[PDB]
């Protein structure tokens, strides 16, 4: 690009402006816009120690018909440099190499093709098929039933859904105020042939394409300092998914997906080192995607710490320890009296020993 155009991209809240610039004609759904933006950016590809890892982001969007999925697919087909838009019956994977393969009516396809799709998803090969798969699905009955399980409502195997790194559910929930806002925005779009006036005018398609092309050129390196935090966060998420039986199986593929999200964010911000902000944003996006589917007590604890095998505790030791914690002796006496009223313990009048009842 001309660097002035890159500066024209790099104002304050540039991430929000870039996210809203993708399909601004459809109100809301900023999370799906961010997911599509990260898919456009994509992760990094590495081949460490004999195995090849993927950086492509594959997203499956399922919702009730009429939630403007097809328009999103058409817009992303237009915006992506190498993009192939195809339907279930109407079918391409090789033609979209190093690009984006937009496919709709995924739920309306025979399982025979689905079987071959697994190899493409797992290894990006067929010939090479290094492409970002964006699939669209619909509920079996035409309406998503939260009573039924996710797999039954998608009528697809659990492994296929797991191979998709991001799942976004959009339900046509009837809300009066939201319906009025959507209706008025749609009327403005019809009458004026233009989007409603937002805070910032979206960037041009060519400018966004060039910016995505440049951000793809960089290969950020993951620092070793953030590994421990990533490990702890992955453990927490996998423990939560283990406690919940209806959660998707969080294998190492989830860790690969969040690492790809962090690398894509690092490419987006044009930094050669991935920072903790990218990890936090990836965790937030994954959580949103899965969600779419007194001195008295302190002093009592302090004296409780001195109950290591003894029934009676010296007054001087407890007094010294409580003062060292930042409490005046008056508050220590007040706490002693307050817990002494409950008769948890008895204090000797010599104020030398306390026998714990």
């Amino acid at each position: 690009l001309t660097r002035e155009e890159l500066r024209q991209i790099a104002e304050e809240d540039f991430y929000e402006k870039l996210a809203a610039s993708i399909a601004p004609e459809i109100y809301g759904h900023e999370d799906v816009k961010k997911a599509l933006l990260l898919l456009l950016v994509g992760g990094v590809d590495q081949s460490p120690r004999g195995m090849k890892i993927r950086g492509n982001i594959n997203i499956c969007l399922m919702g009730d018909p009429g939630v403007a999925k097809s328009q999103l697919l058409s817009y992303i087909d237009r915006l992506a440099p190498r993009s192939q838009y195809t339907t279930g019956r109407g079918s391409a994977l090789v033609l979209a190499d190093q690009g984006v393969c937009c496919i709709d009516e995924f739920d309306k396809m025979a399982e025979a093709d689905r079987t071959a799709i697994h190899e493409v998803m797992e290894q990006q090969t067929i010939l090479n098929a290094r492409c970002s798969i964006l699939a669209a699905a619909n509920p079996a009955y035409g309406r998503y039933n939260p009573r039924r399980s996710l797999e039954q409502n998608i009528q697809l195997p659990a492994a296929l859904l797991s191979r998709f790194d991001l799942l976004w559910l959009i339900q046509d929930r009837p809300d009066r105020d939201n319906d009025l806002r959507l209706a008025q925005h749609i009327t403005y779009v019809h009458q004026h042939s233009r989007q409603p006036p937002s805070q910032f005018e979206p960037l041009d398609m060519k400018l966004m394409r060039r910016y995505i092309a440049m951000c793809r050129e960089k290969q950020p390196m993951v620092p070793e300092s953030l590994a421990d935090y990533i490990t702890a966060a992955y453990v927490e998420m996998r423990r939560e998914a283990w406690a919940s039986k209806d959660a998707t199986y969080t294998s190492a593929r989830t860790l690969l997906a969040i690492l790809r999200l962090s690398t894509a964010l690092a490419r987006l911000r044009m930094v050669d080192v991935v920072e903790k902000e990218d990890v936090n944003e990836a965790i937030r996006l994954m959580e949103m995607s899965k969600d779419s589917l007194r001195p008295a007590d302190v002093i009592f604890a302090t004296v409780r710490e001195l109950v290591s095998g003894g029934r009676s505790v010296r007054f001087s030791e407890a007094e010294q320890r409580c003062v060292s914690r930042g409490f005046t002796p008056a508050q220590f006496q007040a706490a002693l009296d307050e817990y002494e009223e409950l008769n948890v313990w008895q204090v000797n009048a010599s104020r030398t020993r306390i026998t714990f009842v």
């Binding site: 195995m51 659990a158 492994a159 590994a227 490990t231 992955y234 453990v235 860790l255």
Partner: protein
């Protein structure tokens, strides 16, 4: 023939190391962590047994090649390990869950085409998603697993084929989760015949231990060369040159092992597999005679697999 004297000397120097077995176990699949017993079993299968001809006895040619079954959750080291074995082992075959008849366009005669199993003769064939395979194919597997031969009687075509292959199969439990139960069939739903034909069965369970997850994540984020290149030629040399034979002490040990093993329930086929494993471990040490160490190690590995 294909090795110079210096290569043979280096092989002998490595073999004289008592730690060569564990060192080679560490050398197999460096990207795979804390599966030392599985690597040991893979190495023993690579060595295999020794071929014996029973023509004078009137008995059929007994199988002398080792087969191992793996069961666990998908997305684990199954696919990566299978790809590693298929790439490393020459003449290896990778298949996902047979011979066929072709017309000769010239003479209008029905000719035969050899499937991947036949093409992988004297090789190693690996299969993914064993559970998800049709029952018709698994019925055919009984013959190749047992007799190493294959007979076809269809449309007047009668033939017998040699199928000297080793099967390394990966399977998924029917629950997709290790339901607390007793028998492996209660989780995987496999017939007793196929399970009994397998020499070694291993189960991949993801433990609910925090430290294990820490080690896995550190291995992934942090994700030798002198060993595998030499090991290919070393395995070729061991296969071509040496063959072990059984001894009297190992005879008594195996007899006592069998009489103790049946008390746990045991079939003679597992005893045959134990003999094959003892031969493999003897090949590991490049020892021409089977001794107490081989029998003890084979019994230890079998008992460890049964305990797990």
């Amino acid at each position: 023939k294909l090795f110079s004297e210096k290569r043979v000397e280096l092989l002998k120097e490595l073999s004289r190391k008592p730690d060569i077995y564990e060192r080679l176990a560490s050398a197999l699949a460096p990207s795979i962590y804390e599966h030392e017993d599985i690597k040991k079993g893979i190495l023993l299968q690579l060595f295999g047994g020794t071929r014996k001809d029973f023509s004078h006895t009137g008995r059929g040619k007994f199988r002398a090649e080792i087969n191992i079954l793996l069961c666990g959750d998908p997305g684990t080291s199954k696919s990566q390990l299978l790809q590693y074995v298929y790439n490393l082992v020459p003449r290896g075959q990778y298949t996902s869950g047979t011979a066929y008849v072709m017309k000769d366009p010239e003479t209008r005669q029905l000719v035969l085409q050899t499937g991947a199993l036949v093409l992988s003769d004297n090789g190693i064939c690996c299969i993914d998603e064993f559970d998800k395979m049709n029952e018709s194919t698994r019925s055919v597997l009984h013959e190749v697993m047992e007799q190493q031969t294959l007979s076809i009687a269809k449309a007047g075509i009668i033939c017998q084929l040699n199928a000297r292959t080793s099967v390394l199969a990966a399977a998924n439990p029917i629950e997709s989760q290790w339901n607390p139960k007793k028998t492996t069939i209660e989780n995987i739903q496999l017939p007793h015949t196929l399970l009994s034909r397998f020499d070694l069965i291993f189960l991949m369970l993801d433990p609910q231990d925090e430290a294990y997850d820490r080690r896995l994540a550190h291995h992934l984020v942090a994700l030798e060369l002198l060993d595998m290149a030499v090991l290919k030629d070393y395995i070729a040399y061991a296969h071509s040159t040496i063959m072990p034979r059984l001894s009297e002490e190992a005879s008594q040990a195996l007899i006592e092992a069998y009489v103790d093993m049946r008390k746990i329930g045991a079939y003679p086929r597992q005893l045959e597999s134990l003999i094959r494993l003892a031969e493999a471990h003897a090949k590991v040490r490049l020892s021409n005679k089977v001794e107490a160490i081989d029998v003890e190690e084979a019994k230890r590995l079998h008992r460890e697999a049964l305990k797990q």
